Amino acid sequence: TRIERIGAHSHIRGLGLDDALEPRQASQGMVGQLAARRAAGVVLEMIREGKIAGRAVLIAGQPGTGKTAIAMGMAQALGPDTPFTAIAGSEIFSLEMSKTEALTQAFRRSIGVRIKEETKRKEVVHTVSLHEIDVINSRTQGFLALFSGDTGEIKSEVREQINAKVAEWREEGKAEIIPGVLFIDEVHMLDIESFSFLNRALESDMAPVLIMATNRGITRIRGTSYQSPHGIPIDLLDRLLIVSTTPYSEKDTKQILRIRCEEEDVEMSEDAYTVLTRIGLETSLRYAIQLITAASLVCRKRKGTEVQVDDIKRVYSLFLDESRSTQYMKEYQDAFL
Amino acid sequence: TRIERIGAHSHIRGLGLDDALEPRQASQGMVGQLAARRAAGVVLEMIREGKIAGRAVLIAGQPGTGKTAIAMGMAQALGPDTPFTAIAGSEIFSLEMSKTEALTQAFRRSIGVRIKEETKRKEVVHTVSLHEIDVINSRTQGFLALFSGDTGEIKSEVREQINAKVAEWREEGKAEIIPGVLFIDEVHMLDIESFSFLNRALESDMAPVLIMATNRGITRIRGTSYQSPHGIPIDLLDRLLIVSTTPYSEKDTKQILRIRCEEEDVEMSEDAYTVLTRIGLETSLRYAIQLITAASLVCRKRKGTEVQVDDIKRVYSLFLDESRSTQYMKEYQDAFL
Amino acid sequence: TRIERIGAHSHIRGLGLDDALEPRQASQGMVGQLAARRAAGVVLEMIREGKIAGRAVLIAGQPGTGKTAIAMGMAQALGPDTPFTAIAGSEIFSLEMSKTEALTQAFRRSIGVRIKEETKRKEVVHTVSLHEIDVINSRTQGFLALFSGDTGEIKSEVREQINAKVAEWREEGKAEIIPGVLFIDEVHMLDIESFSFLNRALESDMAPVLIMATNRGITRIRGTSYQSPHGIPIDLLDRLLIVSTTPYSEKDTKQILRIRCEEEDVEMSEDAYTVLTRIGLETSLRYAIQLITAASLVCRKRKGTEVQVDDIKRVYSLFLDESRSTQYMKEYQDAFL
Amino acid sequence: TQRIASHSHVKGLGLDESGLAKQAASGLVGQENAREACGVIVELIKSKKMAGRAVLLAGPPGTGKTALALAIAQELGSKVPFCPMVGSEVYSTEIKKTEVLMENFRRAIGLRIKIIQDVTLHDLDVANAMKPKKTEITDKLRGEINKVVNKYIDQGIAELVPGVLFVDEVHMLDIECFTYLHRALESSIAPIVIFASNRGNCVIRGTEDITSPHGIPLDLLDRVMIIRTMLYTPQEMKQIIKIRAQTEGINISEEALNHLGEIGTKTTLRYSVQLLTPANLLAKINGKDSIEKEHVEEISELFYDAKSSAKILADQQDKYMK
Amino acid sequence: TQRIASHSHVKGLGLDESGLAKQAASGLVGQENAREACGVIVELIKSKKMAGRAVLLAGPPGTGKTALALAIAQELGSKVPFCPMVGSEVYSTEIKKTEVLMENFRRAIGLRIKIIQDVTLHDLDVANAMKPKKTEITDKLRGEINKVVNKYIDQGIAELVPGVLFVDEVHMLDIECFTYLHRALESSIAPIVIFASNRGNCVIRGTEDITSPHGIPLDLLDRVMIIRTMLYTPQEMKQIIKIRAQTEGINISEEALNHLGEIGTKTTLRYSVQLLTPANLLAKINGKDSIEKEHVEEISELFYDAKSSAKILADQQDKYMK
Amino acid sequence: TQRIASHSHVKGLGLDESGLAKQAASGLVGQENAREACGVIVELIKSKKMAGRAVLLAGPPGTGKTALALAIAQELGSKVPFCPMVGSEVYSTEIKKTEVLMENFRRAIGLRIKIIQDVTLHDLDVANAMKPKKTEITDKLRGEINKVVNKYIDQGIAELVPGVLFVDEVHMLDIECFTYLHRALESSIAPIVIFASNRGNCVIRGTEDITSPHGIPLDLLDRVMIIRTMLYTPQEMKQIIKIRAQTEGINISEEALNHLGEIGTKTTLRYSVQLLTPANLLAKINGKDSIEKEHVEEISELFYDAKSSAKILADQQDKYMK
Numbered sequence A, B, C: 001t002r003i004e005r006i007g008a009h010s011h012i013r014g015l016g017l018d019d020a021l022e023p024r025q026a027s028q029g030m031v032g033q034l035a036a037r038r039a040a041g042v043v044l045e046m047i048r049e050g051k052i053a054g055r056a057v058l059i060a061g062q063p064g065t066g067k068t069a070i071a072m073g074m075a076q077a078l079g080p081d082t083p084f085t086a087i088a089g090s091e092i093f094s095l096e097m098s099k100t101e102a103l104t105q106a107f108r109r110s111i112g113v114r115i116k117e118e119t120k121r122k123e124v125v126h127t128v129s130l131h132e133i134d135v136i137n138s139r140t141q142g143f144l145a146l147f148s149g150d151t152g153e154i155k156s157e158v159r160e161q162i163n164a165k166v167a168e169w170r171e172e173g174k175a176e177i178i179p180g181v182l183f184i185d186e187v188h189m190l191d192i193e194s195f196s197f198l199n200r201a202l203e204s205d206m207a208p209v210l211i212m213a214t215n216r217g218i219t220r221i222r223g224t225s226y227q228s229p230h231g232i233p234i235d236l237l238d239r240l241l242i243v244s245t246t247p248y249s250e251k252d253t254k255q256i257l258r259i260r261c262e263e264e265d266v267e268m269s270e271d272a273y274t275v276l277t278r279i280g281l282e283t284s285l286r287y288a289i290q291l292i293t294a295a296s297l298v299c300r301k302r303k304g305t306e307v308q309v310d311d312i313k314r315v316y317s318l319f320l321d322e323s324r325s326t327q328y329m330k331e332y333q334d335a336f337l
Numbered sequence D, E, F: 001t002q003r004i005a006s007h008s009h010v011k012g013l014g015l016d017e018s019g020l021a022k023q024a025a026s027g028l029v030g031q032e033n034a035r036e037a038c039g040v041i042v043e044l045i046k047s048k049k050m051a052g053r054a055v056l057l058a059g060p061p062g063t064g065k066t067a068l069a070l071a072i073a074q075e076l077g078s079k080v081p082f083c084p085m086v087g088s089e090v091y092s093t094e095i096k097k098t099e100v101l102m103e104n105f106r107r108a109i110g111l112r113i114k115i116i117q118d119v120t121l122h123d124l125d126v127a128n129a130m131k132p133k134k135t136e137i138t139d140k141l142r143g144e145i146n147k148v149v150n151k152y153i154d155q156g157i158a159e160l161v162p163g164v165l166f167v168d169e170v171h172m173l174d175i176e177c178f179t180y181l182h183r184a185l186e187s188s189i190a191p192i193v194i195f196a197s198n199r200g201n202c203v204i205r206g207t208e209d210i211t212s213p214h215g216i217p218l219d220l221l222d223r224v225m226i227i228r229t230m231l232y233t234p235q236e237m238k239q240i241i242k243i244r245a246q247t248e249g250i251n252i253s254e255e256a257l258n259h260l261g262e263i264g265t266k267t268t269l270r271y272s273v274q275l276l277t278p279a280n281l282l283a284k285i286n287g288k289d290s291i292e293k294e295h296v297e298e299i300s301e302l303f304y305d306a307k308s309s310a311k312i313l314a315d316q317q318d319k320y321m322k
């Protein structure tokens, strides 16, 4: 009906943390990962206090363990007042601007400048980010280049004239700086030059807090041939705080299936929950997530209400997973190109 | 005198085929290649009937066997009513548009849309191709971008609005679709991404018949490292109909020399025809083609009329061929860079 | 105070050559390199006579031997009347023009066209180069594209219309051609295509004299994999006249230090001159050049006047050289990235 | 008359009321497991409840992968948007490759504003954003267009029709396009995407020789559902040759049908279905209204399959250029 | 209040009147040879007599290379221009990389035209030189701007203030940028440049595997002066943790200071200085105004260093993606 | 006075009425087989009957390849168009490399429209097709310009003068440029093209290490005629040194001529012809109007050949940079 629908992270209302940042076993759409959600909440109090510039935290761990789910939990826990720029790591490879300029625009999008104006007397509020100020003052009719995105490289001299004016306003009280977050997911997709730009961009006084997520192991960096942990050089890994994410147990995988069967609005039998937890422990968590909705449609075509174990076994025979898919490809490897 | 002169294919007036598509031994400037010209004529009746979209035929065979000569024979056998876009395989590598966009423009140049207009009453005829309609409707003053060629990438949304309007006209009878041919010579010079675009562009309802020519063997594809026949992947070679071309015999090489000595207007003696056929069987056909005109100029500088064997032997000593050229380079290989 | 200051070549007023081109042991800021300065002066009389087009001279030799110092000696010995375009070898890699077009603009910047105009009667003089004429006639408002540098590729057809007009003027006496020099330093940084453009650009009637400098040995060319002397192919090395530069002795290194201590205006003791010559023979010449100014500031902070040996030994302990730097890196090679 | 192309006989999946696949219905023959799995996917696209789910069709070439997705497009109709897209289309010279993926992701979600008009989210993106040029449209524009479409739903002027994106030839994407597709499939506004590949155990483009199944990395293969397509039997090949003969208007004798079935099990399915129209043109050259065995035998001598041409290339490899 | 970043405690080099380095002054602790060498460089930038001299700061990561150059920038003040620049900034899509180096070389030389105004040579370059675009500015413009600034000095309207260019991360330049930097440092108008690298014995970018120290070729290492930065002792690490605790406003007990000093000699200096603010937020969550050992011990279990995370990656390498 | 360059003494091929080459005529010395073969090519360019024929000049460097094509350009005169072109000119940043080849192919065909004016086909192409930019001109424009030039011939207003394209350094083309040159030489409007190379048995650019003679693939070497250029004897080297001395205005003694002939057989022909003008400037420094042996001996100590400089590089390879 609306533009929004049931996505992969639509069940997560936030990190289920109490007053003492201690994580609850199942709260606000999140379950498991107790040291990772507690470290995410300490980073959440660091973002809400706004005092320290340029802090950086890597969320590392295995695929399917919820690195991105912790990041959209902290994204809904901030609210719309604090900016949260969420980019992919492949988005910096632009044809109209350099990777340094694309990372500088992603850095300056996350620093909100709340300007008030008293204008018989009404205080209009124009919250705006530092990137919009640099695009408006970059040229005449530059305010449509936020919209169409056809800004080139903004000059560095222009950015020092905006940073100085904003410092002046802030000391005169006309503006309030609300520093924010920059989530670079799949950061492993950045090259050595962009990682070395991150080595000096995080030392700036106006840098946002930089969260990053990587499922990669001790691999090669994209611009070079050396092997380093997480695909990230040790020169940048000196500047971060790693948050590991543990693989799930049986009861945690089963409780991810009950919070998801609710978001997709499907009523499942308890025997089908045990068989789907056994499927989700044998192969993958995300394969058992996508079996829930297609099992609900097999239950709708038989005109039942409760999803049985036979709907799970029929949809398990209908759609394969990499493991079984790769096996079948072994035979037609001379048929496959 | 005129812009046109004696080229390499100027003697070919068409494929020498009779009513039953059966090829004549020497007719319309073509000689030899009887199964290849019969398969070319079956493809010529497929192009003239216009019913089946997206058919594709590869002309494979050895160099000098006349793959391109069969394609300019079918190009003059179609006439100017049916479009024939003849491109090289290196022409898709454009700096102003992508290889997908350059192949889409080469695909849509070969679909003619004959529009009539009744306008005391005179039916003006504006035959036009689908590419010109997409360039005219791409922007204001876009009709000069057919001329200067400074069109960028036309939007795909614009091409669906032209395809729908043309379908509407065709059902209302205002337009007549005349599908045509696209000759991609030296197709081996395309990369894997452009070959994979050909895998889906040929399945479209508006695709022209696509003739292609390759002299390559089991070689590597230009974008990858795998070896496949003709430089073309087996995913695209599943979609084609290969037409092999046989190497020539002695009498076929001699009759190529008599049809060419006529186009260049040179009268040669029969002993010089036997010596030039022996030269054309020993080294190459095309070397014996270019010895005819330079032998005619050696005969003009002695102020004779008939070209003798001594003019052939003098020009054979004057201009070398790769085989003899490579031998002489063996000694100065330490002198050559 | 002024835009100019004590650079690395600011002591060199010219090549110290007499009437018979014979070099003086220490004159005009130059010392040593007697066969190289005599060959540089023969090339200087070839540039001043202006008759022979497209001559080329390589200055080869070891680093620190003064290839560039001979080239700024000949640059101040020409004066401002004769043009001297001095480019780096990395400057041809432009994003707005090709390497052929960047070398053609660097070639045509060095050919001055002195135009006079009589205009009660006063002869105004508009000396201008051939590149400025090609930028002015390339488009309307093209005279600001000399300034901003936003010329693209000037058409070759336009350059034949300027070369013909300049030939016409020269024969009518309205213009005087003053051919000049093109110094391509670090020429080894050009690729094979740009070297092959130099193979034909030097054969033109309007080519300037082309001086080039290389410290490289028998190395690989930048565009290919073959090894050739100086990083330059033997096809271009056939067209040049190599000028070798000898490494310095003890007295020549000591006299480079006395001409430099004068340009930097530092008074040094003779024992410090012997210790600095021993440092300059042990490690490098240029390291002993940069120890002079920092030793003068150590002498200024102790409020002395004469620079002693202890200021040299203190600054020798303060700033390291590659040799000692590389040694210290051997231990922290597991600490260094 | 309309031109007849490949997949012109495909008029939807051949399913009954129970959702099981018929052996021969609506131009589809065989492949019953893939057709019930594609019918469960059609129900998802119609439930309009999920977003960003991803399907991979996998199998050998010539096994009904583009045909099964065009049967999905015929079962949805013209009301649901469908956005076919080759995976080699992302290398535009004007914009970055993730912008070509994002513009195709917004092209597959539709809005019907009411007097009735049909528009996509990408049409509103280019409407609210000299030589025209594609521009890298920011997420700053896309969030307020999402708020404007949400206000258009809440006043009742508009109705959203989420659709499907077919990224055929998904192995031609490079590793940056797969890693942006992780974030693209994780959104709550993304269309249901159907990917297709036939390039099993090959290297990812953009990486220096790491190997994963289907040309797709294992971190994207975690997020998709696999539908395999098992090869056809001799009997079903003949049924495809029979359906392509009725679609192209070609009458055929049963002995020529048995010979074209032996040709199609000898080489491939696609070579025997392009032997139909040249044998029909040879039959009208001879004046006979139907194809006999001599027309298929003569046309099969005129045109070669890729394996016989590779045997000619292997026997005479010193003559051809390398 | 102003945000507190890294190097916010650096307020200049800690030197006396004699030019020797103090052990702890102006936020700098230890590294006395590098601080007297950087104080001799500060005197050069102020003598305004030399041009194009080049300094390399070299050492391990986390040893005061960016901190020593920002101490040079605090000792010069805002009157002398300072132009920080990452070495990966030269790969612009609009202009060539030597133009980005030349625009940064002209940005670091200042002119004070008098009513008092501050301008650089690059500001006059873009003033005397539609979508705006960076352009490859010719020397033809730069020579007459140098004559105009020389006439502005001779009539007394202007005064030149040559400054400093910091090319941090100089190993990210390619071999063309180093070879243009040969000609750039040889000019009499060039600014004093301070380069920094921590990438000893690695290949130059833009070359196919030739190896030189610090990522810089030997022909550019001839032209620079080296300042090495020797690692810190346990005692000086604790003094850096004490100075970062007073800079961030954090009270700390002496036993937690000894535990953070053992943590900083166990892993690295930078991991222990980013354990300060999370332990302070955990102390205000518990309500205590100062950090004790239990807050550092709990926060050190929550966040990992890079070596412990690499040990987790080595023990479980079959589970992570490659 | 006009400047004197290389090939300034070349005033045409030295042939008589019978077409045989003289030993020394019109500035050309020796190489009689290549000069009769180039005279047969000159007759072809004048017959104005053929189109798209292609000539390769092949041989060692310094053997008269650029000199033999400029002798062809002097034998045709200024009435026939001539379009010299380096093969590295096709890598423009504005247009694709086949467009640079096609624009050079249309630049070499001339039209004389009559009051008399000289125009090329490319001049009509850019006339019938802000910052100016080169554009990739379509074949849609080129076909109606060919019809307009054909109508201009038929009303008698114009006369076509087909010319010659010299693609010197043809080994610097990549494999796409050779494969477009297949289609370009096969046209009936193409100019006669003379290619030149000295790079025997080297890899084609744009391919990963496949080897063909002269840097040109075997499928393009099928379409060209080869003219080899055999090296010069000691006697002919002295005749080239004598002709370059009369061209540059330099008087020379016979003993210095014998010494420069021994120098030119010792190193190369080109090093001895650039020893003429420095020895002449040394003779006017000494005040003598003619060069003696002491001037050649002193100038030969001042300047080195490439082989002696390579011997200096081999003896001292540890000192030079790599």
Ligand SMILES: Nc1ncnc2c1ncn2[C@@H]1O[C@H](COP(=O)(O)OP(=O)(O)OP(=O)(O)O)[C@@H](O)[C@H]1O
Binding pocket: A008, A009, A029, A030, A031, A032, A033, A062, A063, A064, A065, A066, A067, A068, A069, A070, A213, A214, A215, A256, A259, A260, A285, A286, A289, D182, D219, D222
């Ligand atoms: N802690 C959790 N609580 C609830 N649901 C979770 C949790 N972790 C994961 N999920 C579910 O599993 C899905 C996969 O998790 P997620 O995409 O965040 O993995 P990831 O660690 O980022 O892995 P990858 O590197 O493969 O992207 C989520 O979309 C969500 O539906």
Ligand SMILES: Nc1ncnc2c1ncn2[C@@H]1O[C@H](COP(=O)(O)OP(=O)(O)OP(=O)(O)O)[C@@H](O)[C@H]1O
Binding pocket: C008, C009, C029, C030, C031, C032, C033, C062, C063, C064, C065, C066, C067, C068, C069, C070, C213, C214, C215, C256, C259, C260, C285, C286, C289, E182, E219, E222
């Ligand atoms: N003959 C000389 N007379 C005076 N000073 C000299 C001489 N040769 C060199 N110098 C001094 O030594 C410095 C280094 O010389 P120069 O830069 O010209 O070397 P180079 O041979 O070009 O080497 P590289 O290849 O390393 O650039 C010069 O800046 C100058 O100060």
Ligand SMILES: [Mg+2]
Binding pocket: A067, A068, A069, A213
């Ligand atoms: Mg994730």
Ligand SMILES: [Mg+2]
Binding pocket: B067, B068, B069, B213
């Ligand atoms: Mg051909």
Ligand SMILES: [Mg+2]
Binding pocket: C067, C068, C069, C213
């Ligand atoms: Mg130098």
Ligand SMILES: [Mg+2]
Binding pocket: B199, D065, D066, D168
């Ligand atoms: Mg397909």
Ligand SMILES: [Mg+2]
Binding pocket: A199, E065, E066, E168
């Ligand atoms: Mg640093």
Ligand SMILES: [Mg+2]
Binding pocket: C199, F065, F066, F168
């Ligand atoms: Mg030449």
